[PDB]
Design a binder for this molecule. Structure first.
Ligand code: HEM
Ligand code: HEM
Ligand SMILES: O=C(O)[C@H](Cc1c[nH]c2ccccc12)NC(=O)C(F)(F)C(F)(F)C(F)(F)C(F)(F)C(F)(F)F
Ligand SMILES: O=C(O)[C@H](Cc1c[nH]c2ccccc12)NC(=O)C(F)(F)C(F)(F)C(F)(F)C(F)(F)C(F)(F)F
Lengths: 453, 453
C-alpha cells in the first residue's frame, strides 16, 4: 500500500530536505535507500521520484505522460518565457517554434555552425598554449567561457569575448544571477518578506538586461537585413509549415535567451565532467588521446573528422551516464493510469525522473555502475530503450543534442590532441548544483604537445 | 636682470607649483611666460629648467654635464635598484650592464624579437576584429596591454596574457601601484605621518611581488638552461668586455624590472598619442593607411617590411615631438662652467631639460610648432644637433629606442592596415601625468577593413 517516503518535518512534510545546496545528490541518496520510487510531499504539493528503467520507460510513454514544468522551470519562465524549454506542449508557440527550429538543429545543419565552433575552440587552445609553467587551468570556468561564446556566436552572431575577460559580459552576469535566484526560491517558503524585496529588485534588473540586449540585436538584424550562419537568421526567415506563421520578435528573443540558459552550463559541465573522468582514468585518456592524434591530422579540424572521433564520443556518453548535467525532468499524467501495475496515478499527478539513478540501474548496466568505462557505448544499438536519457524524452527531448555533442567532441578532441593533462591537486569531486551539475574547483595543469594550429 | 623665476610662496618658494596632478604641463606654461630658462626653488634645493635648443645643446655636452637622478628616479630606485635607468654613470654596474646589453638592444637584434612582437600585435588586432558593432576601444589601456606583454615576452619569455584580463597580472598591478606611490612622494608635506603607514606597508609588498616573481623566473631559467632568444638569456650568458665580469643575479632582476618600467608606459603612450593625432588629422591618416596597405602585403608582417614603413616612422617622431612620453630628464654640472655665456653654474648644479618645450622652439621648427606635420621628418639630416631628444642624450640615452620604435611602427602599421578609425566622441585631449604622459580617456571605434591573417 504505502509508497516509500523520506523523513518528515511536521507540517512542512518533506520540503526542508530540499533546503540544501545539493538537492539532486540528496535525492539520489534517498533513492538508494528507498528504491525505484518514492513520494515527496510539501504543503499543497506532491511529486513522485522515479529511479528505475522499468518505471521510467512507462513514464516516457507520450500517449500517457507529457512534459511538466517543475517549480524550477516555472521560475525560469519569468525570463525564458514561452521559449521551447519553459513552454507547455499544448501552447501554440511550442509546436510552432519546434517545427521551425528542428532543421536548424539537425546533424546536417552542424556543417553550418562548425566554422564558428572552431573559432572559439581555437581561442580556448590558444589560451592554454599561452599559460606559463607553474600556472593551472580552472576547468569549468574556461569550459563555460567556451560554451557561452560558441552558442552566442552560432546562435545570433554575437561575441561575448569571454576569453578577453575575468568579469563576464553583463548579459552573462545577469543570466547566472537570475538562474540562481530562480533556484533559491525552491528552498524558501516566505515570498513577501521585506528582506527578499532586494532579491526581486535585482531579478527585474537582470530580466531587463537580457531582454534589452537581445531585442537590440533582433532589431539591428532586421534593419540591416544581413544574412549569417546562425539561428537568428533562420528564426527571422522561418515559417512553421503547420500554421504558416513565423515566430514574432518577442518569442524570438525568448528562444535566444533559452539557447543560452539550456545549453551553456549543461555543455560546459559535460566537458568538465569528461575531463575529470579522463584524468582519473589514465588508460581511458591514452585511448582518447590516441584517437585524437590519429584523426585530427589538420591544424583546423573539419566536420568530417569530428564524426570519426568515435571513442571521444563514447567518453562523453559515459560522462553523461554518470553525471547527466541536466539531472532531472518532470512529467504529468495526461489521464488516470496505473504505473508499474501497482501505482495508481490521477490526472495531473507529477513525476520526477532522477536521471543519475536511471543511469545506475543495476538491472541494465550491471554491478559496476560507478566505474568509468566508455566501452559500454561501443555499440549504440546494444543499449536498451529508455535506459539512457541525458537529453530527455520524445518530442520534448533536447533540440540541441547534436549541437552539444558536436561541440563537446570537437573541443575535447582538440584538447586531447594539443595537451597532456595532470591532476596536480589530486582533485576530490565536489559537485555544485544550480539548474545543472558541475565539478566545482576542478583544476588541472596542461603541458603542451607543441602542435601548431 | 638675474635668472627668471616663477611666483614664490614665501618660505616654501616655488615648491607649491608642483603640487598639482599635471606638473610638466604647468612647467611648460611657466616656460612660455619666462622663456629660455628659469630657476625653480624649494626648501634646501634648487634646479633650472631649460627649454631652448640653444641652451640644451650645451647641456647635452657630456664633458660638462652628466645624468642626474631626479627626485622621481631616486624614489623609483627603491624598486628599480641599480638598473640602467636609475643607476649613476659612475656606478660600476651601470657601465657593465650598458656594455652587456647594448648588443641585445641593437637595430639588428630586433630581427630576433620581431616574431614575438608580431605574436602580441596579432592578439591586439584579433581583439579589435572580435568587437561587436557600437563597441569602442579604450586606446591607452589596450596599448599598455600590448607593450607590457611584448616586453615581458621579448625580455624574459614570460606571458602576462594581458588580453585575457580586465584585472592585470599581480606583477603589473604591483608595479603600477609602486610607480604611482613613488611619484606621489614628490608632493608630500612629510612622509612619516601615520596616514601613509598603509601606503608604506603596501609599497614594501609591491616590491616583494615583483622581486619574488622575477627572481624565481631567473632561477627557473638558470636551473633549466633553456636557450631562448630574449634579454634574460643574454644577461645570464653575457660578460662585460672591460671588467670581464657578468651581471650578478641581483642586478639582472633590477634590469628586468627596469625594462618593464622604462619601456611599457612610454611606448604605449607613444602609440596612444600617434593614433590620437591621426584621427584628429584625417589627411595624414589616409597617407599612413595608404603606406600600410602598399607595404604590408603579407598576413604576417616581416622585419624588412616594418623598415619600409617610412611615413609611419615620421608619424611616430612627430607624435614624439609634440608629446614626448618621457617628457624630462635631469643633468648635473661636472665642473664649474658657464651656460650660454650668461648664466654661471657651479659643480653639482642641476638642470632639467623640458623636452616638450625644446620641441616647440620656434627658432628650430618654425611658427607652426603646435601643428601635426609628419613631413618635418622627411629629411632627418636637416634637424640641428640636440633639437629632438625624446630618447634622452648621449651614453645615458634610451637603450630601448630601437625596440620601442620597431614595436610602435609594426603595431601602428598593422592597425592602419586592418582598421578604419573613427573619433566617435570627438575626444578632447586630456594628458594624465605619471612618470610618463598619456591621453587619458582616449577612445575610438575600429571598423574592420576585413583583411585576413
Ligand atoms: C550536455 C548538453 C545538454 C544536455 C545534457 C541537455 C539536456 C536537456 C534535457 C534533459 C532537456 C529536457 C528538459 C525537460 O524535459 O524538461 C533539454 C531540453 C532542451 N535543450 Fe538541452 N541539453 C544540452 C544542450 C543543449 C544545447 C546546446 C541547446 C541549444 C543550443 C539546448 C536546447 C534545449 C532546448 C531548446 C530544450 C527544450 C526542448 C523542447 O521542449 O522543445 N540544449 N535539454
Ligand atoms: C616611446 C618609447 C620610449 C621613450 C620615449 C623613452 C625615453 C627614454 C628617455 C628620455 C631616457 C633617458 C632617461 C634619463 O636621462 O633620465 C630613457 C632611458 C632608458 N630607456 Fe627608454 N624610452 C622608451 C622606450 C624604452 C623601452 C621599450 C625600453 C626597454 C625595453 C627602454 C629602456 C630604457 C633604459 C634601460 C634606459 C636607461 C638608459 C641608460 O641610462 O643606460 N626605453 N628612455
Ligand atoms: O522543482 C521541482 O518541482 C522539483 C522538486 C520540488 C521543488 N519544490 C517542490 C515542492 C513540492 C514537491 C517537489 C518540489 N525540483 C527538483 O527536483 C530539484 F531538486 F530542484 C532539481 F532537481 F534540482 C530540479 F529542479 F528538478 C532540476 F534538476 F534542477 C530541474 F532542472 F528543474 F529539473
Ligand atoms: O624630481 C625632480 O627633481 C623634478 C623637480 C622637483 C621635484 N621635486 C623637487 C623639489 C625641489 C625642486 C625641484 C623638484 N621633477 C620634475 O620636474 C617632475 F616634473 F615632477 C617629474 F615628473 F619628476 C619629471 F621630472 F618631469 C619627470 F617627467 F617625471 C621625469 F621623468 F622625472 F623627468
Amino acid at each position: 500500500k504505502e509508497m516509500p517516503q523520506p523523513k518528515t518535518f511536521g507540517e512542512l512534510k518533506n520540503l526542508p530536505l530540499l533546503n540544501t545546496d545539493k538537492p539532486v545528490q540528496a535525492l539520489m541518496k534517498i533513492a538508494d535507500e528507498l528504491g525505484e520510487i518514492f513520494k515527496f510531499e510539501a504543503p499543497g504539493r506532491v511529486t513522485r521520484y522515479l529511479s528505475s528503467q522499468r518505471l521510467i520507460k512507462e513514464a516516457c510513454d507520450e500517449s500517457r505522460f507529457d512534459k511538466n514544468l517543475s517549480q524550477a522551470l516555472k521560475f525560469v519562465r519569468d525570463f525564458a518565457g514561452d521559449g521551447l524549454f519553459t513552454s507547455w506542449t499544448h501552447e501554440k508557440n511550442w509546436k510552432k517554434a519546434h517545427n521551425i527550429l528542428l532543421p536548424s538543429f539537425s546533424q546536417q545543419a552542424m556543417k553550418g555552425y562548425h566554422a564558428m565552433m572552431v573559432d572559439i575552440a581555437v581561442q580556448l587552445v590558444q589560451k592554454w598554449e599561452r599559460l606559463n609553467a607553474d600556472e593551472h587551468i580552472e576547468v569549468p570556468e574556461d569550459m563555460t567561457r567556451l560554451t557561452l561564446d560558441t552558442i552566442g556566436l552560432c546562435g545570433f552572431n554575437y561575441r561575448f569575448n569571454s576569453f578577453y575577460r575575468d568579469q563576464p559580459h553583463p548579459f552573462i552576469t545577469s543570466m547566472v544571477r537570475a538562474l540562481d535566484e530562480a533556484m533559491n526560491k525552491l528552498q524558501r517558503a516566505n515570498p513577501d518578506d521585506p528582506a527578499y524585496d532586494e532579491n526581486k529588485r535585482q531579478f527585474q534588473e537582470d530580466i531587463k538586461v537580457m531582454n534589452d540586449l537581445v531585442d537590440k540585436i533582433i532589431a539591428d538584424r532586421k534593419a540591416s537585413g544581413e544574412q549569417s550562419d546562425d539561428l537568428l537568421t533562420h528564426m527571422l526567415n522561418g515559417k512553421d509549415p503547420e500554421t504558416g506563421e513565423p515566430l514574432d520578435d518577442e518569442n524570438i528573443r525568448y528562444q535566444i535567451i533559452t539557447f543560452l540558459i539550456a545549453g551553456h552550463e549543461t555543455t560546459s559541465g559535460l566537458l568538465s565532467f569528461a575531463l575529470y573522468f579522463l584524468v582519473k582514468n589514465p588508460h581511458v585518456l591514452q585511448k582518447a588521446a590516441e584517437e585524437a592524434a590519429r584523426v585530427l591530422v589538420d591544424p583546423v579540424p573539419s566536420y568530417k573528422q569530428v564524426k570519426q572521433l568515435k571513442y571521444v564520443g563514447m567518453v562523453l556518453n559515459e560522462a553523461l551516464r554518470l553525471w547527466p548535467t541536466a539531472p532531472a525532468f518532470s512529467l504529468y499524467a495526461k489521464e488516470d493510469t496505473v504505473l508499474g501495475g501497482e501505482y495508481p496515478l490521477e490526472k495531473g499527478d507529477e513525476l520526477m525522473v532522477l536521471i543519475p539513478q536511471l543511469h545506475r540501474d543495476k538491472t541494465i548496466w550491471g554491478d559496476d555502475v560507478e566505474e568509468f568505462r566508455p566501452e559500454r557505448f561501443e555499440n549504440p544499438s546494444a543499449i536498451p530503450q529508455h535506459a539512457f536519457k541525458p537529453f530527455g524524452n520524445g518530442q520534448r527531448a533536447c533540440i540541441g543534442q547534436q549541437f552539444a555533442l558536436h561541440e563537446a567532441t570537437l573541443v575535447l578532441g582538440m584538447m586531447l590532441k594539443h595537451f597532456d593533462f595532470e591532476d596536480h591537486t589530486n582533485y576530490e569531486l565536489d559537485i555544485k548544483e544550480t539548474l545543472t551539475l558541475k565539478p566545482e574547483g576542478f583544476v588541472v595543469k596542461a603541458k603542451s604537445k607543441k602542435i601548431p594550429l
